[PDB]
Design an enzyme around this catalytic site. Sequence first.
Site, PDB file in Angstrom:
ATOM      1  N   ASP A  35       0.827  -1.202   0.000  1.00 58.86           N
ATOM      2  CA  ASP A  35       0.000   0.000   0.000  1.00 58.86           C
ATOM      3  C   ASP A  35       0.865   1.256   0.000  1.00 58.86           C
ATOM      4  O   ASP A  35       1.407   1.654   1.032  1.00 58.86           O
ATOM      5  CB  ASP A  35      -0.905  -0.055   1.271  1.00 58.86           C
ATOM      6  CG  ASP A  35      -1.779   1.158   1.387  1.00 58.86           C
ATOM      7  OD1 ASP A  35      -2.359   1.422   2.483  1.00 58.86           O
ATOM      8  OD2 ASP A  35      -1.877   1.852   0.364  1.00 58.86           O
ATOM      9  N   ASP A 219      -1.245   5.652  -5.415  1.00 54.85           N
ATOM     10  CA  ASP A 219      -1.676   4.804  -4.283  1.00 54.85           C
ATOM     11  C   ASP A 219      -2.083   3.401  -4.702  1.00 54.85           C
ATOM     12  O   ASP A 219      -3.204   3.166  -5.219  1.00 54.85           O
ATOM     13  CB  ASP A 219      -2.847   5.492  -3.564  1.00 54.85           C
ATOM     14  CG  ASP A 219      -3.315   4.725  -2.349  1.00 54.85           C
ATOM     15  OD1 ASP A 219      -2.641   3.752  -1.953  1.00 54.85           O
ATOM     16  OD2 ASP A 219      -4.304   5.154  -1.720  1.00 54.85           O
TER      17      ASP A 219
END
Length: 329
Positions: A35, A219
Amino acid sequence: QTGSAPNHPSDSADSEYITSVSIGTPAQVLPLDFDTGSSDLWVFSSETPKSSATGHAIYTPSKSSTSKKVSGASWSISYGDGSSSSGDVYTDKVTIGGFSVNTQGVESATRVSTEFVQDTVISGLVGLAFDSGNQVRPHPQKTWFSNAASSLAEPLFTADLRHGQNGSYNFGYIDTSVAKGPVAYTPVDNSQGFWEFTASGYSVGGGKLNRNSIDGIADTGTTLLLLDDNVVDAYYANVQSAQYDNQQEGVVFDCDEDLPSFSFGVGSSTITIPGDLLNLTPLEEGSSTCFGGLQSSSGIGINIFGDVALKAALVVFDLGNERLGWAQK
């Protein structure tokens, strides 16, 4: 010295991408969500309530000869989507794609929210945003990538995400053989702890780039490409069946639409997301209505170049130069 770790989409709509990580001695292999929008490496463990961890792979630090509890350390996190987790902290050897960090902070969850409980195929996260964001108190822990960076051939890693197929998270080298264009770079602003950058403008359906710049974050932990209402309006302007669906909370259109590409400027270089990648998924099996990969960021207050955008490119997160590279795929 490098690492290369295969990843795969969790489902038919590429909701999130799953990669194996080996923790401890002997190795305990967990599937984790890499992440670049967060900074904590946290796992389901033998200390996670059994009612929450059932069906998930877990980390058991007592079965690892290299684990050490970090006295006095705790962590708590809430994510963009309202999910959450919290716990205590161990250090242990963590190996990703053959490359090891010998003493990495491994945040063991003693509580996890329902979202994580339900996602049985994930056993935690590897945060790959900046160290400033890490939530361990009183002493923050460095990310796996930050710890690895000085020991790798080069302090960089790349994301290669694919629609419906295996891809790769690589560390310490740039495998542009997966791409059809060169890496184009732009500077990163890590002031808020993210891989924040500015795109110099955009285009819908392959006209010339405009100069309406877009500030946003790269992201890997967000599914969609999330852009402001002005860009979303521009994207869907000539998609005839497009409309906002209040149940889906997003724009949908007929599955057979021939969607325009969406292009954006990295410096003066163009990265193009083909129309195929902007149709995320049928609303349900056999549906003639589909949900768009490009949706509005109005609800979250920041633009997010999530997986929909990342899929179009080989993306280089260069921690040594604090820059972000995109090579057309």
